[PDB]
């Protein structure tokens, strides 16, 4: 496992940290999370 | 169709007379038929499995179901998860059609017909027949067969005792 | 000579934190446990690590549900 930072695709803010397995998920994870700056849900992508 | 009509017309009075049931509902009737292949050689070539699938889907006419292991056996070079057999169930009129085909053009067309062992009942009222060679099928040609996979033909009825099951089974052709 | 033993964990201070018939204020912890050794009753909640807590003000009552089990309730 490794540590991961998730970045908002509309602001560039780095709002979330999480983990993943690099062998099972070699791509960049995308999740829809709340963005505190815009105060709405936005797609977040691994840096 | 024809077998069901004949049964409901004759065997119901015949059974209600031969055993003296208080109500007609007590009459033992066929319930369902299960055809199980069984394939313990799947961990080397998986074409045996889907093979068994198509000859089942021809002999019965409907998609079988892949069954997998409930545990792991080192001796049979297995671990849990191997698809290790296929099965089919039959109910209703199509069951009667399969029964008629088996009793006319399949069981008589076997290599020999020395009856059916009357002591093979489970002790409750159900019966099991074991087909050894797959080529005995009417609609299936052995030229497209890779192995003689036997079939468990399980016949289940609502007969409380083996006696009534034997009555019904012998009444319908092959004893 | 050596023992090869000698380790233990810190005690976690489990058990009943309030008494039967005692007046209690909302949010108070009533019981600490592993598993549901005691179940939540009326006006009583179950925490994420199985802690039982009061949701209102009232008096604590330890009670017996069906033969083999227990619960605790809070009544105003």
């Amino acid at each position: 496992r490794v540590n991961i930072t998730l970045e908002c695709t509309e602001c560039g803010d780095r709002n979330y940290i999480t983990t993943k397995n690099k062998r099972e998920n070699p791509e960049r994870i995308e999740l829809k999370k709340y963005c505190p700056r815009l105060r709405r849900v936005t797609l977040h992508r691994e840096t | 169709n024809r077998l069901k009509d004949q049964y409901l017309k004759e065997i119901v009075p015949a059974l209600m007379s031969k055993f003296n049931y208080d109500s007609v509902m007590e009459v033992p009737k066929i319930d369902k038929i299960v055809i199980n292949t069984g394939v313990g050689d799947a961990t080397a070539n998986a074409k045996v499995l889907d093979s068994a699938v198509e000859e089942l889907a021809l002999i019965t006419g409907q998609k079988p179901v892949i069954t997998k292991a409930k545990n792991s056996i080192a001796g049979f070079r297995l671990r849990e998860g191997m698809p290790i057999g296929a099965k089919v169930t039959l109910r209703g009129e199509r069951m009667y059609d399969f029964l008629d085909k088996l009793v006319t053009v399949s069981l008589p067309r076997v290599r020999d017909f020395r009856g059916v062992s009357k002591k093979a009942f489970d002790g409750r009222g159900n019966y099991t027949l074991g087909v050894r060679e797959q080529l005995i099928f009417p609609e299936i040609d052995y030229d497209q067969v890779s192995k003689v996979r036997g079939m468990d033909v399980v016949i289940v009825t609502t007969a409380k005792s083996d006696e009534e099951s034997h009555e019904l089974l012998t009444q319908l052709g092959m004893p | 000579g050596s023992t090869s033993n000698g380790r233990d964990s810190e005690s976690k201070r489990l058990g009943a934190k309030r008494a039967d018939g005692q007046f209690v204020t909302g949010g108070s912890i009533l019981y600490r446990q592993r598993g549901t050794k005691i179940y939540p009753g009326t006006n009583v909640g179950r925490g994420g690590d199985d802690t039982l807590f009061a949701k209102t003000d009232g008096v604590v009552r330890f009670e017996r549900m069906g033969r083999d089990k227990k619960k605790v309730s809070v009544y105003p």
Binding site: - | - | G1, S2, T3, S4, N5
Partner: protein, 133 residues
């Protein structure tokens, strides 16, 4: 007499307060040895008593041993100090409380039975008596 396996290799020594929980009556044979006091009884003592009382009867009749050495005890050699963990197991013992019947015999007359039990009781570290069903 040794147990085939044990769950733990070390065990507390325990105590011997009170009268024996069960086994205070003759249940299989006609004659028995009863403990009047409490004592640890090892498997060497059991074996010696059994051989004496069986040899006197010339392999006639039947003998039942009503106690088993379930417990183990440990020890430390000469020259070692205190500490550094528990010692190594040595033998197996049965704690016997007062009132326990520990040997029963059958199949022989009064004289043979009583003399065999007298011969056996001299091999044991506990004070005994002879009882009849």
């Amino acid at each position: 007499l040794v147990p085939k396996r044990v769950k733990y290799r070390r065990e507390f020594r325990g105590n011997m307060r009170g009268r024996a929980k069960g086994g205070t009556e003759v249940a299989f044979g006609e004659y028995g040895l009863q403990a009047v006091e409490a004592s640890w009884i090892t498997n060497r003592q059991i074996e010696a008593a059994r051989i004496a009382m069986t040899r006197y009867m010339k392999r006639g009749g039947k003998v039942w041993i009503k106690i088993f050495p379930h417990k183990s005890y440990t020890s430390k050699p000469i020259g070692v100090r205190m500490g550094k963990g528990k010692g190594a197991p040595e033998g197996w013992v049965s704690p016997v409380k007062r009132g326990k019947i520990m040997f029963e015999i059958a199949g022989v007359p009064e004289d043979v039975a009583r003399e065999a039990l007298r011969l056996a009781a001299h091999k044991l570290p506990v004070k005994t008596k002879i009882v009849k069903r």
